[PDB]
Structure formats: C-alpha cells, structure tokens
Amino acid sequence: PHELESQFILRLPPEYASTVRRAVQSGHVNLKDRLTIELHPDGRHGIVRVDRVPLASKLVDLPCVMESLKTIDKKTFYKTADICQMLVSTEKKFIWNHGITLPLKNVRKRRFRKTAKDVEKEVKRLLSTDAEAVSTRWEIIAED
Amino acid sequence: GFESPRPYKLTHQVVCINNINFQRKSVVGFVELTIFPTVANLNRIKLNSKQCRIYRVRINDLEAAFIYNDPTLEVCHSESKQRNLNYFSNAYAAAVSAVDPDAGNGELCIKVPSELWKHVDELKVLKIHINFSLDQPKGGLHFVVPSVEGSMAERGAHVFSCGYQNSTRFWFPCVDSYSELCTWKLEFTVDAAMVAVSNGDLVETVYTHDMRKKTFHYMLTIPTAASNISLAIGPFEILVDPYMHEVTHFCLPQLLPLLKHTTSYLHEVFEFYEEILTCRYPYSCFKTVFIDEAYVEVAAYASMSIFSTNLLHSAMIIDETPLTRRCLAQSLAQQFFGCFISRMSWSDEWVLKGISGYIYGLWMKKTFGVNEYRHWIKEELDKIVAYELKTGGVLLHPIFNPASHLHFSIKHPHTLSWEYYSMFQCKAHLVMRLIENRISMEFMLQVFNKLLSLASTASSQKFQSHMWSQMLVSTSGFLKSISNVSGKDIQPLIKQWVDQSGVVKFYGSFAFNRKRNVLELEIKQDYTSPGTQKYVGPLKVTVQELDGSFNHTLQIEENSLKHDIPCHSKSRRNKKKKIPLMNGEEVDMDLSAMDADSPLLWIRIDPDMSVLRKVEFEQADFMWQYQLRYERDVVAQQESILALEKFPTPASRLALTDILEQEQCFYRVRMSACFCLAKIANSMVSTWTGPPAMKSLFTRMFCCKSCPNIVKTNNFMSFQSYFLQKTMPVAMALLRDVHNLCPKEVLTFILDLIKYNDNRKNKFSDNYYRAEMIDALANSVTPAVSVNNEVRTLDNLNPDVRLILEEITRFLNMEKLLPSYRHTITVSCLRAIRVLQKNGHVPSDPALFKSYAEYGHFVDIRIAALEAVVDYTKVDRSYEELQWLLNMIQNDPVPYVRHKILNMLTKNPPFTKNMESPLCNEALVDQLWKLMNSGTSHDWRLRCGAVDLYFTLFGLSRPSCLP
Amino acid sequence: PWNLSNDEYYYPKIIQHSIPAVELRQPFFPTHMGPIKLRQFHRPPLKKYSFGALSQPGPHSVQPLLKHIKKKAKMREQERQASGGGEMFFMRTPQDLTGKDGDLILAEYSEENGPLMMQVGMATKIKNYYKRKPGKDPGAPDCKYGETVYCHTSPFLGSLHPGQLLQAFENNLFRAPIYLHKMPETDFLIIRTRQGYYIRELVDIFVVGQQCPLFEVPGPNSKRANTHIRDFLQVFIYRLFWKSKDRPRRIRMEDIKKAFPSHSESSIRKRLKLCADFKRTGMDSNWWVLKSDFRLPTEEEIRAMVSPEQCCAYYSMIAAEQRLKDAGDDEVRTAPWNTTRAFIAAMKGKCLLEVTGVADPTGCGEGFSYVKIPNK
C-alpha cells in the first residue's frame, strides 16, 4: 500500500539555522551525523541535536494550513502534502498563534473568525460515571 | 525500435542521368549505392528494378554477376486454365511479395564477387555501380512530346516521374521501400534550353564542353527514401515566390500569368502549417511543378510537388480557386507528414495518412470556416459508411489474411483497389479526428510536434541509421507518444475503430412520458449487416426543449434498449419568451406546430459525429422543420433537409422556402434545400397552388424589379448568391406536371435565363454558370413517346426538345470558336446530348462521342465523351464499342485516361454477374484475364482496375458463362 | 474563393491531475472519514509508527536529499528529451508525488477553513493576471512561477489597477489570489517516512487570499450529495472487481464494509445487486461473483463516473457538517454550500452579495462575505 508522507517544519535558533542551512546546501552525508531528531513519548516534546549540541523542542500546531506543491515545469503544481505542525527549537502551549509568513502574525487572535456555542470527552466521562452509578440528582443552579 | 528486413544498410546513393532523348524516349545513366553489410556472408544483394535494361554491375570496381527476374510481369502462367479471381488475387499477392523490398527480396539479384568476401565478413563498405538504360518506358518516367515541329523546348516536350507509393524502381534501380533512408546526390544532363527539377537543393549547374547541354547537380542531405525521389525535366518557366524565397514554381511555357495568380496563396499555407505545428518546413527548398498528362492531380515527394496544369486558373475564374487551393494545401500537409516522417511498415500507413488528412482539415477549418469544415467531415463520413456498408470494410492497421471479405489482398499498397485506397485515407483522417475528440487538440498538436522534433534531431546526424530511424513512425511509437503527452491511452478507441473494420448503425425512436416528465429514447443497432459492428461505449445526445439545449451521455451496452432522460419545464410557452439555442443566442419560435404536452423541440443522436455512424432517427415532421429553421449546426440542417423529403406537407415547403430566402444561412444548406423543394413539389402535385417552386423566389432574388422575366446582368462578386443562382434552375428543372412532363413555364424560364445572359460587366467568368444552364436544360428532358419503335428523325422531334437541341448546338458551336476555361460547356453539352440520346429523342449513335474521345482533345472532354460511350455500350449492348474501350485501355498515351476508363466501366458495367448478356463469351473472359495477367503489368493501378472490372463482371468464382 | 461560411451567425463568439488522483486511490481520497478525522481535516497529526526504523525510540539522523533531487531532475529531463523535447506528463505513480524531488513551494492559507481545498495528488496552475497601463506599457513584471495572461476583465471581485500584476492559483475548484513571500531564515522542511527523516530547504512561500469558488459544494442530504455517495461506492466496487485475480471476478462484502463502515449494508447490496450475485454453496462460496453478461466498465468510463473535484466538494460538506454539529443561523450561512451557491450565483449575475457580513472568514473588515442579497 501507499502511506501519505508526513511533512512538518523545523524552526531552529538563528546561528544553528545558519549552520544547518550551510550543511544542507553543501550536500554531503556529514550533515546526517551532525543533525539528529529525538521525539519524546509525550508527542509534543523533543531534542534536535545540531553538531551534537542538544536543543529543546516543542511540536506545535499551526493556525493556518500549508500545502507543499511540487512542480516540474513551474507552471503546473501538484499538491504533495499538508503541513500543520512545527518543531520549534531553542494543550494551549502546543498551539502556535502566529503564521509562518510575515503578513500572518497574530492570525489566530485577529484574522480568524471565532464561532462558539476535550469538552465532548469530559461529557462522555460524565455520562460513563452516571451509568456506573445508581441514583442521579440534577438541578440547574444559581449563585452558590 | 526499427530492425531492417534487409541484411545491408544503405548510406548514400548517386543517381546520374545522361542522354535524355525525347525523340526516341530513352534515358541512359548509372546508379552508385554505398551499402554497409550488417550480417557477414552477405553474398547476394537484392535491389528493385523494373523496365530498366541493366548493362553492367561493378561491386568495389570488380565485375559482378546479376540475375534479373520479375514475377509480376505475367502473374499466372499462360497455359493455366484457371479463370477465378481468388486464384489471381493470391498469385498477384505472392508475386508482389516476391519483389517486396519490405521483406528481404527484390527483383535484381547481384552476386558479391569472391575476393570481397574477406571485405564483407568484417563489415566494411561496398560500392555498387550499376549502369542502366530505359529504352522506351511504359511506366515511371512519362514523356510528353507534342507533335509540333521545332526544337524540343520550342514544342513543349517534358518528362516527369509518375506512379504511386514505391514506383521509383520504374526508372532507376534502388531499394524501393519507405524504410531505407539514405542521403542523395542527383545529376541530370539535360538540354541547354531545359531545366531539371528534382529533390534536394541545386548546388550548381555546369555547362558541357560544347555548351549544348548542361548538368544540374542536386544534393539531398536530409535522409529520404528512394520512393520520395522525383524528377521533372522540361522547358519550364521559372517563378520565384515573391513572399517566401526558397520556393520556386515551375510551369509549362505560356502559362506564367496563371502560375503567378494560382501559386500566390501558398505562403499562407506555409504559415499555417508552421504555426499549428511548431517545426519549420524541414527541407531547404520547395518546388511546385505544373505539368501535362499528370498521373494524379497532386503528387508530393521530398521537397517537391508535381501538380497538373489543369489546376492553373486566372483571376477571373471562380469555382476553381478553392479546389486548387486545397490541392496545394494537401500537398504541403503530405510534405510534412508523408515525406519527412515516413512509414515503418506497410502497416502504420494509417498514422501518416491520418495526420496528413487531419492537419489538412485543420487548414480547411481556419481558411474556409468551421461550417465548411463540418460539411466536409459529414461528406467524408457519409462516403465511408456508404463504402463500408457496400463492401465489407476498410481495415486500418492490419496484422500479418486479416481481411478476407474483399477480393484483393491488403498486404501491399500495389494490390489495393483504388477506391479502397481512397477510403483508406478518408477513414484514417476521420479516426484521427476521433483521437482528437478523446484527447484534446492542443495535446494532439503536441504529439505531432514531438514526432517532428524527433525526426529533425534525427535528420541532422551522420550516423548511418543509428539515429535515422527516428524519422520513421510506427503505430506503437505513435500511441506511446500520445501516452507520453497526455497520460491517457486510447487503446479502446484504437481497438474499436482501427483494428476492427466496421461502422455502426443507429436506429432511434423516442416517446415522451407526460406523467413522469421523461424522454424515453429507444436506440437499437443493426450489427448483423456485413459491414457493421457493435458499439458499447458512451453516446452523446442533444435535446432541444423549450428551456434550452441540453446534452446527455447515454451508456449503450449490448442488452440496452430504453434510455430514460429527464425533461425540463414548459414555462416558455406560458409567457412568450425567447427559446435559448445551442449557442448563447435565443430566438422567437412559432410554437403553433409543437405538441401541447411535450416541451422538447428536437433531438439529435450523436451531434458531434464522435463515432463512425449512420443514424436513422424517427422524429415528428414539425421537429424536423424546427431543426431546419432554428438550429446552429450545419450538419443538423442538412440531415433535416434530408429527412424532410419523406414529409411533403406544406409546412415543410414553408420551412425550406424560409431557408432558401435566408441569407446568414450557410450556402450549401440552401443549395440542398433547392433540390429538396423540387422533390417535395413533385410529390404534392394536384395540391400546389401558385407558380412552380423557386420561380417567384428566383425573380425576387436575381431578376430586375421592373422586369420579372428578364434576369439581372451578371455580377458574381458575392460568391454565395452566385452559387445559389447557378444551382436554382438546375433543381427547378426537376419539376414535373401531372403528365410527368416538365412544365413549359420552367423550360421557358430557363431558356430566357440563357437568352438574357449578359456578362460584360462582372470581373469573373461565366463558364460555370452557363454550364449549369446546360445542365438545367438536360434535367428537363423526359422520355419521348415513340410509337411502334418509330425511327427518331428530325420531323418527328418533340417541340420542346427542338429548342433545347438548338440551344446546345449553339453553345457547342460557340465553344468551338470562343472556348471556355476548361471546356466546361463542351462537357455539359456532351452530357446533355447523352441525356437526349438516353431518352428517345436523338438517334443512339456513339460517333460524336467517339470523335471527342480522341487523343488530341482536352482531358475533361475526353472523360466526358468516354463516359457517354460507356453508358452507350451498357444500354445498347454494343460489342464493338466494348472492344473499342478495351483497346483504348490497352494503348492510350495518357495513363490517367486508361485508369478513368477502367473506373467508369467498373461503376457503370456493361453487365453484372447476375445478367445474361450477349457479351458473356469465353472470348471476353479470356481478354479480361489476359488484361489482368499481362497487358496491365506496367502501372499497378491499371492492374487493380482490371481486377475490379473482372470482379464486377464475373465475380469471385469461376466465370459462369464458360465451358 | 473565400470563407463563405456564415460563422458569425452559427458560432457567435485543462487541469490534468496525477493518475493516483483521477483514479481516486484510497490513501489520497479516503472512502470514510470519522469524527476525529473530520475535526483534523487537512490538519493531519504526526502519527507514531508501530513498525519501522522510526518506531524504535531514540535519536534519528536526518538525511540530506540534494543528490536525489538533481538525479531525479536530470532523469526527468532525459525522459523529456528522449520523448521529443515537448512538455511531458510525469505524475503517473504514487511515488512521483513525494516531496523528495522536484521544486517544492509552500502555500499558506489566510482563512481557517476554506470552502474548497485540494486533496493530495491534484494539480493547480499559477496564472499571473496583468492589466496593461493605459496606452504604452513596458510589459508584465516577469515572475518566477506561472504563466502570464493579460486580463481586461478582472477574474476576482475587484478590478486590477493599470500596471498591476496579480498572481493566482487557478484550478477547477477555486481561483484565489496568491502572494509570494520569502521563507523565514530559520525554517526547513522535514519529510518523515517510516524509514527516516529527510530535510529540504524552502525559499518560496505563497500566501493564498480569500478563495473565489468555482465548484458548488452540495448541501447535506441533497440530491447531488446522495448521488455522489452512490457513485463513489459504485466506483470503489468496480475497482475492487478490476483488482480481482479470480477468472470469474469475485469480491468480498466485508472489504466494502471496511471501506464504507457508515453505510447500511442494504445500500451496498443495492449497488451489488446489478453487476454481481452472491454464491452461498459450492465454489466461490461467500463471494460476490461478477455476472457473466455484465461488461465491467473500462478505465475511462470509471474515470467519467466520479471526478476528483466532486470528492473535494463532498469532503468540504462533511467537514463543515461536523464543525457545525460540534458547535450546537449565522454559522449556517457560513457553511460552504450556502457560500458557494451565493458566489456562483453572483458570478452569473443572479444576485448580489453583502460584502460586509458574518460569512467573512477574517472576522474583521478584511475579506468578503459570500451570502446572497437581492439585486433590489
């Protein structure tokens, strides 16, 4: 079978980003030894090791949706993957408010329309507790 | 991948021609080939040669021994008593396959000398120098030598290479296949007052030491086949094209102004074919030669085209400008895709013929409009469905018999019937239009550009065919290039319309369900006829309802019969609103004839002609009248005209009369509505109210306002009312009264059209309009009432026919003093005299037509007179006229006339196989078997015509009228 | 001697997806999306592998892929020059749609949830609309990507200024103005697969403005919606019959029940009723064999049954159904069936749109709102 590839964006500190960029544009396999990525079983924490120097990482959710688009002639572009996550290196904490481009900053707060009436999972847990019970008493309340 | 059937590879060929003697009809020359053996122990080398006397052959300047035998000279033995045609077709196919260069074979077998075997085993070059002589050629080179005295340039004598497909073996020894590409060096030593035109570019022209002859040196660095090499030697008037400067036009002497006017359009054809494809013209020059007594009307070779002079017209000649224009266009299309990109086998010929015909149709679309394109595509499709339902079917891309339903073998081009060859090219370009329908036109032009670009990168290498075979296209390579550019493969469409050899027949009938508001179509196929096949794909249908025009796709599987499609509202009959059409416009329709319960105005099954089909739809007559009036498609207007002949109601007369009065209708629809109105008027006699049909309309459109019976003086500058004016009396003469005689109101009208004709004021000639007037006079002739077989003399002539006979006598005699453009009035008057002889008016005597069928007349007069003699010998069962025609087939100077006599005697045969006739001797069977076997051995087109004539007369089995 | 075809009275006046996309292959076009997969629509989380090299916990080296990129580009140029040098079609396999080769750009979206969005494997074009200056103009400012077209009539809602070039994504789904920005100096692109991590740099990232929809998203329980569900199930059933190796082609029902688990089995048996029959006993037992009189449709007929853009419109409808369902009339107006109907009706000139409203995907004055207002 075929499994859709999973692309994400890696953001590094600027000096380490310059060393990683120089090693990528060089093209040797020396970069392979220099750059490693260890993702912790939390799922939202990691180490990126640049030149064997550990950096602390967080996998965050991006507010917009990006899409990688490949081309052969630079006139027709084929969508290859959807990017929604970034492993910035240096829950509410795992949500990034800004977008990658310069015009998109504070997009989640300002350029996103918010419509409102985790919570569903809590309601399911409450229903399960009511089922495991015997007698349930309920009242919409006031200030108390 | 191309692997040669020959064990050698030919690199270069020198063709030198000396001593072209026009009095003795003789050429001398040599040929030097440069072959590289690909297999060791080559021993014999097999080349192609017909009619050339081979003097000596030297291989690497060592004397070699050759043996010549041609099995196609006498196909079957003289002392075999077989007389069936299947025996001759198998023997003729085996004989042509025994000289085939597409196998390893050939007619001249040269033995390599012994001392060169150590030169041939380790594969090194061999230079074969044959020198030959054509003593008096019966094929290949045609010598047109007129019998005026003077020098050969002063009398207008010329030579040209004639023939079709691989017929270059007829004038020099070669490897006469389309797959043996080599570079060429061509020298011709001609008279000093003559010019030698050939393929390549002329590098120099040196004089001889007496300065009485000069040698033309041509060089061809683009590797072409031997079959694309041509020659035209004559006293030609040279004209350089004032727009494109590598294009030279050659004509016969005294025809330079006609050449200037005729070949003035060709730069636009060049610009079109170089902008739809993106390759420039591949050859370094282009040469158009116009000659007399041509083989075909247009032949295309490498960097050269040979047309007949009968295409040359002046500025004041209309009705000939589009025909000559499209002959030039298809010669240029074959320059691109028959001569530069060549054929890999005899299969994959459909690819080249289809690409040539398809890009020529794109040229016709841009030049003459989309409506003329649709009319042309419909007439080609009707042609092929008529031919395939008549006899078997045309099989593009056979696999090697694959087609055993037809009396010849399709393994070689020189065994095909000529009608099969014509329908082959026709079906190839329609199947290419179908491939454009599946894979869009820009991807199609990208396919063609990819083929041309591979060929032009191949054309500049020097490697001897390591890369020169990229100039040869195949079917698998064409389908692979299509799959490369588009990502879709067309293998179901290729499997249905190429590999399978049949057309489909659709019988449709509808019923409108008022309750559920649906349209229940009923489409059934006739798949048990001999020419037909079963269609299982999708099918487009276009329904015009009151809310507009809607397209539906139907899936027509084998077990399918009823297709329920949904219908829209009828709220444009509640309010008067305009009904929107197939295009963006909308019109006011008179909805009084429509049914109250159904919204649908007309239905068209397969409107875009996306299959090779024949549709028989059963609409109601008001739906055919609405489709004739308000449709924006010319093929639907034509099919509604064709279907209105079965409904002679006065609403259909009003529909056709409104079509005839309507400018901004396509003119070829109105020209059909004339004949449809004539047929309808003949069918509703004893109901017709006023004057005869189209007469008041003719006086309203083309006559004076103050004088109704005097026609206006001729001004032919509109070109659509000219065609309608010259076609309306021809249809008006088919009117008949209750007594089955043409009325004296229409005959008098035609005679007044003839008398009051004044052409001193238009800038165009009158020959076609006057010729159509003679055709209208010939249409009015009804059969005479002979009593007791009374001899037809001058006193007991019809009082109607005496006026007609006086007019055609005046016209023919005035043509003898002031001739027309191509003796169009001679052809029309000979045709009218044959019409008067076919009825009992003029005595049935063929001596006039036998005097017009002599050699010195123009070729149109000759074929009209020979058509009259063929019709006479069919009706009068004349033995001596049939022997006259068969003798004229055997020894006539013009081979086109011989082919045309065999063609006309096949179309209008003197007897068929079912008839008992007095002309069914063993003598006639022996004459026609001798004409198939020997006698026609020099043309490859007379032999297939003789096979067609023997099939038409005696059938596929043993001639019955025999011991 | 001339035209003579009255053409002005009879006739008065493109996107090629990959072969995995036009064949609706199931990684790229899913048959069924659950609720947690509809909430993560076009935002796929980083899944943990169970088997593979990355499934073992620990540090993992990323691998540079610049010999791979230039080797694949040189190989594709050899393929193109061997095929005559014209433009070629390359995306014929799923392995052509990897990010490991070709010139990648990124495309960011301004709206959170657009009305239409491309699936993986689908193609789009970049058109540079350039309105010339009044009278003399130098020529379109040249751009690295896309082809230039001179637009007198603005494609979008506004009109172009004289001398203004605007790039745009153009496909069958939408048309949207894009704006080229340079990438940040810190961000790279990591393509992870089961075997390892791979790194590219990016240099070009477009910002995609508010989409102008060209395809109408159907509503829930619509006739077009149920027709697409039935046709998608039929196409999947035909492609399972084509994949069957048995000489009487035969499939199993619980393959279809694994693909479409929300479907009642009456609907699946309705699709299998014509074109198949159930064998209970003997050979082929508990299989749905193909009927012997039934001609299985060819590949182009199956492609003509369902289009990929219809699948994208259906996915937009069911994702918006989930978001509305989770959030308990203003929100209903912002549903893509309403907004796509409003915009396409405004483009025919049926009605007008209030450009300031609540369907505004920004939530501020920027951006349009596609909800119908009467033209009176």
mmCIF file of all heavy atoms in Angstrom, chain B residues 766-787:
data_model
loop_
_atom_site.group_PDB
_atom_site.id
_atom_site.type_symbol
_atom_site.label_atom_id
_atom_site.label_comp_id
_atom_site.label_asym_id
_atom_site.label_seq_id
_atom_site.Cartn_x
_atom_site.Cartn_y
_atom_site.Cartn_z
ATOM 1 N N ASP B 766 -18.016 33.331 -66.842
ATOM 2 C CA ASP B 766 -19.389 32.868 -66.873
ATOM 3 C C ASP B 766 -19.498 31.400 -67.245
ATOM 4 O O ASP B 766 -20.602 30.926 -67.516
ATOM 5 C CB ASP B 766 -20.186 33.706 -67.865
ATOM 6 C CG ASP B 766 -21.625 33.855 -67.468
ATOM 7 O OD1 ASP B 766 -21.985 33.317 -66.409
ATOM 8 O OD2 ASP B 766 -22.394 34.504 -68.208
ATOM 9 N N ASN B 767 -18.383 30.674 -67.269
ATOM 10 C CA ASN B 767 -18.372 29.351 -67.879
ATOM 11 C C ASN B 767 -19.102 28.332 -67.022
ATOM 12 O O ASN B 767 -19.792 27.450 -67.547
ATOM 13 C CB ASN B 767 -16.935 28.908 -68.129
ATOM 14 C CG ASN B 767 -16.059 29.079 -66.921
ATOM 15 O OD1 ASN B 767 -15.922 30.171 -66.391
ATOM 16 N ND2 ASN B 767 -15.465 27.993 -66.474
ATOM 17 N N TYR B 768 -18.991 28.452 -65.702
ATOM 18 C CA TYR B 768 -19.663 27.510 -64.822
ATOM 19 C C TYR B 768 -21.153 27.783 -64.737
ATOM 20 O O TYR B 768 -21.938 26.838 -64.674
ATOM 21 C CB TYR B 768 -19.033 27.551 -63.439
ATOM 22 C CG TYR B 768 -17.648 26.964 -63.410
ATOM 23 C CD1 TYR B 768 -16.533 27.778 -63.312
ATOM 24 C CD2 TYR B 768 -17.455 25.599 -63.490
ATOM 25 C CE1 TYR B 768 -15.270 27.245 -63.294
ATOM 26 C CE2 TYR B 768 -16.199 25.062 -63.470
ATOM 27 C CZ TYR B 768 -15.110 25.892 -63.371
ATOM 28 O OH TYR B 768 -13.849 25.359 -63.348
ATOM 29 N N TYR B 769 -21.560 29.050 -64.776
ATOM 30 C CA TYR B 769 -22.979 29.387 -64.763
ATOM 31 C C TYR B 769 -23.666 28.950 -66.052
ATOM 32 O O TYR B 769 -24.769 28.393 -66.018
ATOM 33 C CB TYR B 769 -23.132 30.888 -64.529
ATOM 34 C CG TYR B 769 -24.538 31.423 -64.582
ATOM 35 C CD1 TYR B 769 -25.506 30.979 -63.700
ATOM 36 C CD2 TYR B 769 -24.890 32.392 -65.504
ATOM 37 C CE1 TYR B 769 -26.787 31.475 -63.748
ATOM 38 C CE2 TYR B 769 -26.162 32.893 -65.556
ATOM 39 C CZ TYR B 769 -27.105 32.435 -64.674
ATOM 40 O OH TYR B 769 -28.379 32.938 -64.729
ATOM 41 N N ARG B 770 -23.007 29.141 -67.195
ATOM 42 C CA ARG B 770 -23.573 28.691 -68.461
ATOM 43 C C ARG B 770 -23.571 27.171 -68.564
ATOM 44 O O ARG B 770 -24.499 26.575 -69.130
ATOM 45 C CB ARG B 770 -22.798 29.312 -69.619
ATOM 46 C CG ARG B 770 -23.016 30.797 -69.767
ATOM 47 C CD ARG B 770 -22.629 31.269 -71.147
ATOM 48 N NE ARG B 770 -21.269 30.873 -71.475
ATOM 49 C CZ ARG B 770 -20.246 31.712 -71.561
ATOM 50 N NH1 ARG B 770 -20.433 33.006 -71.348
ATOM 51 N NH2 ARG B 770 -19.035 31.258 -71.858
ATOM 52 N N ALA B 771 -22.542 26.525 -68.010
ATOM 53 C CA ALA B 771 -22.503 25.069 -67.980
ATOM 54 C C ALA B 771 -23.610 24.498 -67.104
ATOM 55 O O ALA B 771 -24.236 23.490 -67.456
ATOM 56 C CB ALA B 771 -21.136 24.612 -67.490
ATOM 57 N N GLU B 772 -23.897 25.150 -65.976
ATOM 58 C CA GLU B 772 -25.038 24.753 -65.164
ATOM 59 C C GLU B 772 -26.363 25.038 -65.847
ATOM 60 O O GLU B 772 -27.338 24.335 -65.578
ATOM 61 C CB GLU B 772 -25.043 25.466 -63.813
ATOM 62 C CG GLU B 772 -23.938 25.119 -62.830
ATOM 63 C CD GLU B 772 -23.976 23.707 -62.313
ATOM 64 O OE1 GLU B 772 -25.042 23.103 -62.332
ATOM 65 O OE2 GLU B 772 -22.950 23.205 -61.825
ATOM 66 N N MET B 773 -26.422 26.048 -66.716
ATOM 67 C CA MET B 773 -27.636 26.265 -67.500
ATOM 68 C C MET B 773 -27.874 25.126 -68.482
ATOM 69 O O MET B 773 -29.017 24.709 -68.690
ATOM 70 C CB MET B 773 -27.560 27.594 -68.250
ATOM 71 C CG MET B 773 -27.744 28.825 -67.387
ATOM 72 S SD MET B 773 -28.852 28.553 -65.999
ATOM 73 C CE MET B 773 -30.438 28.541 -66.826
ATOM 74 N N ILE B 774 -26.805 24.615 -69.095
ATOM 75 C CA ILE B 774 -26.941 23.438 -69.957
ATOM 76 C C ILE B 774 -27.344 22.213 -69.140
ATOM 77 O O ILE B 774 -28.133 21.379 -69.598
ATOM 78 C CB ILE B 774 -25.647 23.195 -70.750
ATOM 79 C CG1 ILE B 774 -25.277 24.440 -71.537
ATOM 80 C CG2 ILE B 774 -25.829 22.070 -71.741
ATOM 81 C CD1 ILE B 774 -26.357 24.861 -72.505
ATOM 82 N N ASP B 775 -26.833 22.099 -67.911
ATOM 83 C CA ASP B 775 -27.247 21.005 -67.028
ATOM 84 C C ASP B 775 -28.723 21.112 -66.649
ATOM 85 O O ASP B 775 -29.422 20.096 -66.553
ATOM 86 C CB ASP B 775 -26.370 20.986 -65.780
ATOM 87 C CG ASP B 775 -24.930 20.621 -66.087
ATOM 88 O OD1 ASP B 775 -24.664 20.161 -67.216
ATOM 89 O OD2 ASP B 775 -24.066 20.790 -65.200
ATOM 90 N N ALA B 776 -29.216 22.334 -66.452
ATOM 91 C CA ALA B 776 -30.636 22.538 -66.188
ATOM 92 C C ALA B 776 -31.479 22.208 -67.410
ATOM 93 O O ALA B 776 -32.573 21.658 -67.280
ATOM 94 C CB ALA B 776 -30.888 23.973 -65.742
ATOM 95 N N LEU B 777 -30.994 22.541 -68.607
ATOM 96 C CA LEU B 777 -31.694 22.135 -69.826
ATOM 97 C C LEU B 777 -31.722 20.625 -69.986
ATOM 98 O O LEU B 777 -32.695 20.075 -70.507
ATOM 99 C CB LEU B 777 -31.034 22.754 -71.049
ATOM 100 C CG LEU B 777 -31.487 24.125 -71.522
ATOM 101 C CD1 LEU B 777 -30.910 24.357 -72.895
ATOM 102 C CD2 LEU B 777 -32.991 24.209 -71.555
ATOM 103 N N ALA B 778 -30.666 19.944 -69.545
ATOM 104 C CA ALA B 778 -30.631 18.492 -69.638
ATOM 105 C C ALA B 778 -31.523 17.833 -68.596
ATOM 106 O O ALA B 778 -32.009 16.719 -68.817
ATOM 107 C CB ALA B 778 -29.200 17.992 -69.495
ATOM 108 N N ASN B 779 -31.749 18.492 -67.459
ATOM 109 C CA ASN B 779 -32.605 17.912 -66.428
ATOM 110 C C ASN B 779 -34.074 17.890 -66.821
ATOM 111 O O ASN B 779 -34.828 17.072 -66.288
ATOM 112 C CB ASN B 779 -32.457 18.684 -65.125
ATOM 113 C CG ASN B 779 -31.363 18.144 -64.260
ATOM 114 O OD1 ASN B 779 -30.682 17.190 -64.626
ATOM 115 N ND2 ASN B 779 -31.178 18.749 -63.100
ATOM 116 N N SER B 780 -34.496 18.759 -67.733
ATOM 117 C CA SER B 780 -35.903 18.863 -68.093
ATOM 118 C C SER B 780 -36.353 17.800 -69.080
ATOM 119 O O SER B 780 -37.551 17.714 -69.363
ATOM 120 C CB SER B 780 -36.186 20.239 -68.687
ATOM 121 O OG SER B 780 -35.548 20.386 -69.936
ATOM 122 N N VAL B 781 -35.439 16.994 -69.604
ATOM 123 C CA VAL B 781 -35.771 16.056 -70.669
ATOM 124 C C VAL B 781 -36.440 14.827 -70.073
ATOM 125 O O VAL B 781 -35.825 14.073 -69.312
ATOM 126 C CB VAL B 781 -34.524 15.666 -71.470
ATOM 127 C CG1 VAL B 781 -34.926 14.885 -72.689
ATOM 128 C CG2 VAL B 781 -33.765 16.901 -71.867
ATOM 129 N N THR B 782 -37.692 14.623 -70.419
ATOM 130 C CA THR B 782 -38.499 13.460 -70.108
ATOM 131 C C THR B 782 -38.465 12.487 -71.276
ATOM 132 O O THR B 782 -38.192 12.889 -72.410
ATOM 133 C CB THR B 782 -39.941 13.894 -69.815
ATOM 134 O OG1 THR B 782 -40.332 14.899 -70.756
ATOM 135 C CG2 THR B 782 -40.040 14.453 -68.416
ATOM 136 N N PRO B 783 -38.691 11.190 -71.037
ATOM 137 C CA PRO B 783 -38.629 10.221 -72.140
ATOM 138 C C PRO B 783 -39.732 10.421 -73.167
ATOM 139 O O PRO B 783 -40.892 10.655 -72.829
ATOM 140 C CB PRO B 783 -38.766 8.866 -71.434
ATOM 141 C CG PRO B 783 -39.223 9.175 -70.063
ATOM 142 C CD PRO B 783 -38.666 10.507 -69.737
ATOM 143 N N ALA B 784 -39.342 10.332 -74.436
ATOM 144 C CA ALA B 784 -40.219 10.627 -75.554
ATOM 145 C C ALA B 784 -41.198 9.489 -75.801
ATOM 146 O O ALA B 784 -40.963 8.338 -75.432
ATOM 147 C CB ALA B 784 -39.408 10.874 -76.821
ATOM 148 N N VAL B 785 -42.321 9.820 -76.447
ATOM 149 C CA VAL B 785 -43.394 8.806 -76.674
ATOM 150 C C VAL B 785 -43.231 8.180 -78.061
ATOM 151 O O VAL B 785 -44.067 8.466 -78.938
ATOM 152 C CB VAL B 785 -44.783 9.450 -76.520
ATOM 153 C CG1 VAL B 785 -45.134 9.686 -75.060
ATOM 154 C CG2 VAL B 785 -44.895 10.742 -77.314
ATOM 155 N N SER B 786 -42.216 7.331 -78.237
ATOM 156 C CA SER B 786 -42.012 6.642 -79.538
ATOM 157 C C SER B 786 -43.200 5.717 -79.808
ATOM 158 O O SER B 786 -43.615 5.002 -78.876
ATOM 159 C CB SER B 786 -40.716 5.877 -79.540
ATOM 160 O OG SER B 786 -40.760 4.809 -78.606
ATOM 161 N N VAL B 787 -43.690 5.702 -81.050
ATOM 162 C CA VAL B 787 -44.831 4.814 -81.420
ATOM 163 C C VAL B 787 -44.305 3.735 -82.370
ATOM 164 O O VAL B 787 -43.678 4.110 -83.376
ATOM 165 C CB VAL B 787 -45.974 5.617 -82.068
ATOM 166 C CG1 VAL B 787 -46.637 6.557 -81.072
ATOM 167 C CG2 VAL B 787 -45.504 6.383 -83.295
#
